[PDB]
Design an enzyme around this catalytic site. Structure first.
Site, short mmCIF file in Angstrom:
data_model
loop_
_atom_site.label_atom_id
_atom_site.label_comp_id
_atom_site.label_asym_id
_atom_site.label_seq_id
_atom_site.Cartn_x
_atom_site.Cartn_y
_atom_site.Cartn_z
N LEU B 43 -18.51 2.39 16.94
CA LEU B 43 -18.39 2.68 15.51
C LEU B 43 -17.56 3.93 15.22
O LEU B 43 -16.64 3.88 14.41
CB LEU B 43 -19.77 2.85 14.85
N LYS B 47 -16.66 14.95 19.13
CA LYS B 47 -16.14 15.91 20.10
C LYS B 47 -16.85 15.84 21.46
O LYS B 47 -16.20 15.98 22.50
CB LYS B 47 -16.14 17.34 19.53
N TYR B 48 -18.18 15.58 21.45
CA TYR B 48 -18.97 15.44 22.68
C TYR B 48 -19.94 14.24 22.65
O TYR B 48 -20.85 14.17 23.48
CB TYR B 48 -19.69 16.77 23.03
N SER B 49 -19.72 13.29 21.72
CA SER B 49 -20.53 12.08 21.59
C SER B 49 -19.72 10.87 21.12
O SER B 49 -18.59 11.02 20.65
CB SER B 49 -21.73 12.32 20.68
N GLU B 50 -20.28 9.66 21.27
CA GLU B 50 -19.72 8.38 20.83
C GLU B 50 -20.86 7.61 20.18
O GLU B 50 -21.98 7.61 20.72
CB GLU B 50 -19.12 7.58 22.00
N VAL B 51 -20.60 7.01 19.01
CA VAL B 51 -21.58 6.27 18.21
C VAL B 51 -21.29 4.78 18.35
O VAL B 51 -20.19 4.33 18.04
CB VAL B 51 -21.56 6.74 16.73
N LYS B 66 -26.27 6.85 19.93
CA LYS B 66 -25.37 7.98 20.11
C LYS B 66 -25.41 8.35 21.59
O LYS B 66 -26.44 8.82 22.09
CB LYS B 66 -25.80 9.16 19.22
N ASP B 154 -23.15 22.36 10.32
CA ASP B 154 -21.97 21.49 10.45
C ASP B 154 -21.88 20.52 9.29
O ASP B 154 -21.54 19.35 9.45
CB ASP B 154 -21.89 20.80 11.83
C1 LIG Z 1 -15.84 15.31 -0.09
C2 LIG Z 1 -17.27 15.01 0.31
C3 LIG Z 1 -18.21 14.51 -0.76
C4 LIG Z 1 -18.45 15.28 -1.90
C5 LIG Z 1 -19.33 14.85 -2.87
C6 LIG Z 1 -20.00 13.65 -2.73
C7 LIG Z 1 -19.79 12.87 -1.60
C8 LIG Z 1 -18.90 13.28 -0.61
C9 LIG Z 1 -18.71 12.38 0.57
C10 LIG Z 1 -19.50 12.57 1.71
C11 LIG Z 1 -19.42 11.68 2.77
C12 LIG Z 1 -18.56 10.59 2.75
C13 LIG Z 1 -18.60 9.54 3.83
N1 LIG Z 1 -18.42 10.12 5.20
C14 LIG Z 1 -18.58 9.12 6.30
C15 LIG Z 1 -18.96 9.81 7.59
C16 LIG Z 1 -19.16 9.01 8.83
N2 LIG Z 1 -19.05 7.66 8.86
C17 LIG Z 1 -19.25 7.27 10.17
C18 LIG Z 1 -19.20 6.03 10.81
C19 LIG Z 1 -19.40 5.99 12.18
C20 LIG Z 1 -19.65 7.15 12.90
C21 LIG Z 1 -19.71 8.40 12.27
C22 LIG Z 1 -20.04 9.64 13.06
C23 LIG Z 1 -19.48 8.44 10.89
N3 LIG Z 1 -19.42 9.52 10.02
C24 LIG Z 1 -17.75 10.42 1.63
C25 LIG Z 1 -17.84 11.28 0.56
CL1 LIG Z 1 -16.90 10.92 -0.85
#
Ligand SMILES: CCc1ccccc1-c1ccc(CNCCc2nc3cccc(C)c3[nH]2)cc1Cl
Ligand SMILES: CCc1ccccc1-c1ccc(CNCCc2nc3cccc(C)c3[nH]2)cc1Cl
Lengths: 326, 325
Positions: B43, B47-51, B66, B154
């Protein structure tokens, strides 16, 4: 010859794994320097070993050091590979290091420290709840090691360390443990006399994880009935006679016939004829506070001649005897 | 040396708890058998993991596995202890299991499955209300983890999973999270470049939960202004310069003087002199539908050099920007 048998659970777990996992004879052991550990005191006499409390000088933490009498190198490689395979599993003693003293070159295993409670004094303080709790902890270790394709083959109270203050339990001494491969004929000269399953005593070599469930049943019976050991044989042949005095000789013949087992002629003059006893016959004033219908039903489902009929560790965990534990 | 500092909220929450709660180094991890999980597909990468996407064969339920690159065992114990402490908290990713494959022996964490909506796909269809709604969901996670004596360290969009269809949000990747102890000096090499608070950039080690509120401010600014990332540094030193181009150099010196911080000589030729900018400047035709006086007031109260002056997650939840949620 005898009828073949295989485990009802985790049958092919080793078959579907690469040889690196179960081929312990080809495992390369890296022996570290024991200078990082200072021996404090002797805890026990292991089994062809000696167990010590020690201090890791690099972090000031107590550890357990098991010094092995090098009788057979193949057996040392086996125990190390199994310990590496199960390292970190629930209620399994944790192998921390493998070392040798620079001058003696004696194989030594370093483990996580366990603060052993002396149970010879708290044996009377134990409650029905405490027995259910700790039996469930042992079952978590057995279902895990069985899932990892390993039979302990030496389940007994001496191989169960408990730190009662912290309600912590560890299954130790994996020196007799073996990898389970369906159809494999194993050595029957395993486990300790009072805990040997009928399969070992009748020389039926194609046994499995279910052997550990018999041993667990022996432990349960000794605890709930305050009768130590529960089956008190004086030799391996007499051990089957002690089991027959409880389970009866009718079900023993059904067992040997089911697997076409040839009963050793040494049983001829000692086995006799014995009725099947009711488990309620073992209840007395000194143990009635640990006995219940649930406990007797659970014990009856472990102490069966037929290794295939015994509950697996997973089935045992679903028994009503454990409905009150977390 | 530098002047000491402490959190304005949840200061002594770990002090009043037994060592078993926060002493992760002494925590015993029980690694189950990964054979109960079948890996389906990759998915995401870290940096140090895979999902990976996976299925629990015992109940036919999808999970997320993870797989951790075992670089430091102390860090693995830390993430597990924190996940166990927060397990079940509002909008916190749920740790379901801790397993190792029998042959590889590689540490793996099993979490609930999230049907993640793509960060770039929802970006154009987002409303002012949606931003308020999801910001409040993040604040519930932060006020909870802060109350539990934990700093995420983070906070960034990559660590926020959203199922837009079900209006579900989860704060993920607790690999950099730490227990807050008043007076403790922490490692400043945390968070991701764009989200690093000024305290990290000036090497002020006695920081707290307020670091996550800076990071949250960076996220809100990028969203309401449609400027991703808001503070676009090209290295950790340049990152402070990009903040200074918005907040001004006068308040940066007031901050370093207040805490008697020794500014690294690497800042000498790059920091320059910068005026304090008005937030209204960043408003344009493409983002004005997501901007409001309430949003700018809220942002102004998060993006402050002085970590002590920033709104707490609880104070933030009481801001007029959230009166409609
Ligand atoms: C600018 C940020 C923000 C401000 C205000 C409201 C929401 C958000 C926001 C916060 C988070 C996201 C979606 N991020 C997806 C993160 C993510 N998917 C993954 C799929 C697989 C694996 C990992 C580690 C993943 N990691 C999008 C948005 Cl638009
Ligand atoms: C209430 C638990 C219970 C339920 C039912 C039946 C038995 C027991 C039970 C009863 C007592 C013990 C404790 N045995 C300690 C074993 C042991 N000490 C050691 C000390 C030093 C060295 C070694 C190898 C040691 N080895 C363990 C167990 Cl599992």
């Amino acid at each position: 010859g005898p009828v073949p048998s295989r485990a009802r659970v985790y049958t092919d777990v080793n078959t579907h794994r690469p040889s690196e996992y179960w081929d312990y004879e080809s495992h390369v052991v890296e022996w570290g320097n024991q200078d990082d550990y200072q021996l404090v005191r002797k805890l026990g006499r292991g089994k062809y070993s000696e167990v010590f409390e020690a201090i890791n000088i690099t972090n000031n933490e107590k550890v357990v050091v098991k010094i092995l009498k090098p009788v057979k190198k193949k057996k040392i490689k086996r125990e190390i590979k199994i310990l590496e395979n199960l390292r970190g599993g629930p209620n399994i003693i944790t192998l921390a290091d493998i070392v040798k003293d620079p001058v003696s070159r004696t194989p030594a295993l370093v483990f996580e420290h366990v603060n052993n409670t002396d149970f010879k004094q708290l044996y009377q303080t134990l409650t029905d709840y405490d027995i259910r709790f700790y039996m469930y902890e042992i079952l978590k270790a057995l279902d895990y090691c069985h899932s990892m394709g390993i039979m302990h083959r030496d389940v007994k109270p001496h191989n169960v360390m408990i730190d009662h203050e912290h309600r912590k339990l560890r299954l130790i001494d994996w020196g007799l443990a073996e990898f389970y491969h369906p159809g494999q004929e194993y050595n029957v000269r395993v486990a300790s006399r009072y805990f040997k399953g009928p399969e070992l005593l009748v020389d039926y070599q194609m046994y499995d994880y279910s052997l550990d469930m018999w041993s667990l049943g022996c432990m349960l019976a000794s605890m709930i009935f305050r009768k130590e050991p529960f089956f008190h044989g004086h030799d391996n042949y007499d051990q089957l006679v002690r089991i027959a005095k409880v389970l009866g000789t009718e079900d023993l013949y059904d067992y040997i016939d089911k697997y076409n087992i040839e009963l050793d002629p040494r049983f001829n003059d000692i086995l006799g004829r014995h009725s099947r006893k009711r488990w309620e016959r073992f209840v007395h004033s000194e143990n009635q506070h640990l006995v219940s219908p649930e406990a007797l039903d659970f014990l009856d489902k472990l102490l069966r001649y037929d290794h295939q009929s015994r509950l697996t560790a997973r089935e045992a965990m679903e028994h009503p005897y454990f409905y009150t534990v977390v």
